[PDB]
Amino acid sequence: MASTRCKLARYLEDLEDVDLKKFKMHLEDYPPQKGCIPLPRGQTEKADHVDLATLMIDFNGEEKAWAMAVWIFAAINRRDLYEKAKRDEPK
């Protein structure tokens, strides 16, 4: 009826081109949080925009993946995106 994978792709695509590069560099440069596993660069860089959403939903899960998606926007100063993201995020 409505795959969410296509929805997240529209968000990472609706971001600015220069901001797109900052989202990946910030993800690969993610510091350790608690014995967390570092994301292999060859996997993320080789992962396409659609495939990228598959590693976040498949490896981190829909609950944790969203936590990383919202916490990163506040980092690049995009609080306005959190107000809309919370309204467009399905329950």
Side-chain angles (χ1 to χ4, degrees), residues 12-35:
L12 312 168
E13 277 53 294
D14 291 322
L15 249 69
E16 187 173 314
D17 57 301
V18 178
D19 180 14
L20 212 175
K21 178 167 64 164
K22 286 181 175 296
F23 186 99
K24 296 184 176 295
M25 186 174 179
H26 189 39
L27 190 82
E28 300 178 289
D29 296 327
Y30 182 85
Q33 185 174 209
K34 187 175 185 306

Side-chain angles (χ1 to χ4, degrees), residues 24-64:
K24 296 184 176 295
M25 186 174 179
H26 189 39
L27 190 82
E28 300 178 289
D29 296 327
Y30 182 85
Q33 185 174 209
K34 187 175 185 306
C36 181
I37 183 177
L39 278 57
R41 293 175 56 166
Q43 274 57 299
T44 298
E45 303 297 294
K46 186 173 180 182
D48 186 58
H49 34 102
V50 176
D51 185 44
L52 176 57
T54 307
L55 287 75
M56 291 174 87
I57 301 169
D58 190 274
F59 197 100
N60 295 87
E62 191 71 270
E63 200 297 297
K64 187 175 180 305

